[model samples]
Target chain A: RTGKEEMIGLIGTVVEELNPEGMIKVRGELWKARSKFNGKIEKGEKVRVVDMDGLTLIVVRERK
Target chain B: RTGKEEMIGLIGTVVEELNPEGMIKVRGELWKARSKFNGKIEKGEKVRVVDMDGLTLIVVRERK
Candidate 1:
């Protein structure tokens, strides 16, 4: 399967900021996240799962 | 959905060695992989998709 699908409706909170590489807690499951959503992300910020590389969740800033 | 399903039939080869954070090319798609499959994974070795978070594919050594 492509890396585009299966990443729907994934929302989580940033518990640890990696600056460029951070960790997010989604559904109580902690997974690595990247601040590639147009830019870097902050702690406690909400993010939407855009893509993945395995366990690291490629996240973008949640659109209002 | 839980992070246990939908990880079937995923197979790839280690292209870049992160040593602990290597990258795997699966289905022609490049993804970051962790060396948690019993131990560290070597380059050119095949891996099986066992679990996933969002994009990062948690893999294990393929069992013969």
Candidate 2:
């Protein structure tokens, strides 16, 4: 299976600042990630995986 | 706006075979694309943009 769908909605933490692209830690793994809305997401913030581009995770800042 | 959200549901043509990752033509532009379901999508096939990861479009094979 593609396993992409399974990643959607998973919550993770930003390991690097996402001035659109950065790194995130999810499912106990560190993944290359990009902010879906193309906005900067600060490091240590929470994010949710909404989609995948190949091996990269598409993420958005998570609301409190 | 990032315009990434606006891309969702838009249809495009596969310019390169997506054996997971390839290229697509949408809105008169050629974009790097990946199969959202991780399935093979042959060239000349239609796909729907479901999400974005940075500049890469995440797509799925369009259903007939």
Candidate 3:
């Protein structure tokens, strides 16, 4: 309905490996995601949305 | 010497509270940082670089 602005600060689960770039599930939707820290994020890991570049979400590992 | 690209994926320490926008210390250099998630990040918290806008870094909270 809105834009990526509404996705910021939301938490998501990794559906695909993000070796800096991959896919994630957020808010019942699948989104292209990139690891903000440029690290490898395995599948099933949790990530947090920080920003967006066009349609790609900039994410980092969720703080425990 | 390069540009913001080199700063991507780097870790930084928050020097000022980021209620979305604040300052951080990275690689011994003080840098202007913005919370990409648009959430409040307390002083002394750790953050990671995701992208850059002008001279400010877009960051998210680092995982523990």
Candidate 4:
């Protein structure tokens, strides 16, 4: 059974930089997120959980 | 705005396996897809396009 459908579009904060792939704090859980946003993903940045691969999140920088 | 919301819960077939990460064919377009399903994702397998990380997709094998 996969939880893939429930994990997408989640919002979180950057706990580590996703220079390519890294970690984020989502719903108090530290989950892995990746960035192919063609830019640096840094700590404390707000992001949207774009997608999930297993437990990893595909994230992009959230605009203010 | 990001296209994250539009991509969730999409259904597709495996053009390539997500042995950790691979590719999937969606709407005749070859898109990158990943597996955190703790198993091998194979070509021609029916899958649900769960999420997107840029051009990539988070896919899980669909049941018949």
**Candidate closest to the true structure, highest DockQ:** 3
Candidate 1 wrongly placed segments (more than 4 Å): A1-6, B1-64
lDDT of 1 by residue, A1-64 (tens): 4343344336689998748788898777888888653456888988766557876777765544
How much DockQ does model 1 earn?
Answer: 0.02
In order of TM-score, best first, we have 3, 2, 4, 1
lDDT tens digits, residues A1-64, model 3?
A: 4565577657899999999899999989999999876579999998877778888998877754
> What value of lDDT does candidate 4 attain over all alpha carbons?
0.69
lDDT of each: 0.66, 0.81, 0.82, 0.69
Candidate 4 lDDT tens digits, A1-64: 3375455545689888888788899887888888745367889988765556777787766643
Q: List iRMS (one decimal) for every candidate.
A: 12.4, 7.0, 5.6, 7.7
Candidate 2: global Cα-lDDT? Answer: 0.81
- In order of appearance, the predictions have TM-scores of 0.43, 0.50, 0.54, 0.48
TM-score of decoy 1: 0.43
Candidate topping lDDT = 3
List model 4's recovered fraction of native interface contacts, to 2 decimals. Answer: 0.12
lDDT of 4 by residue, B1-64 (tens): 3375455545667776678688887776787788645478788887765556677777666643
Residue A63 local lDDT, model 4: 43
The chain A TM-scores for the candidates, taken one by one, are 0.78, 0.89, 0.91, 0.83
Residue-wise lDDT of candidate 3 within B42-62, one digit each (tens)?
999988776788889888787
Chain A TM-score for model 2, please? Answer: 0.89
lDDT tens digits, residue span B1-64, model 2? 4577667657789999998999999989999999877579999998777677898998877653
Q: What is the interface RMSD of candidate 1, in Å?
A: 12.4
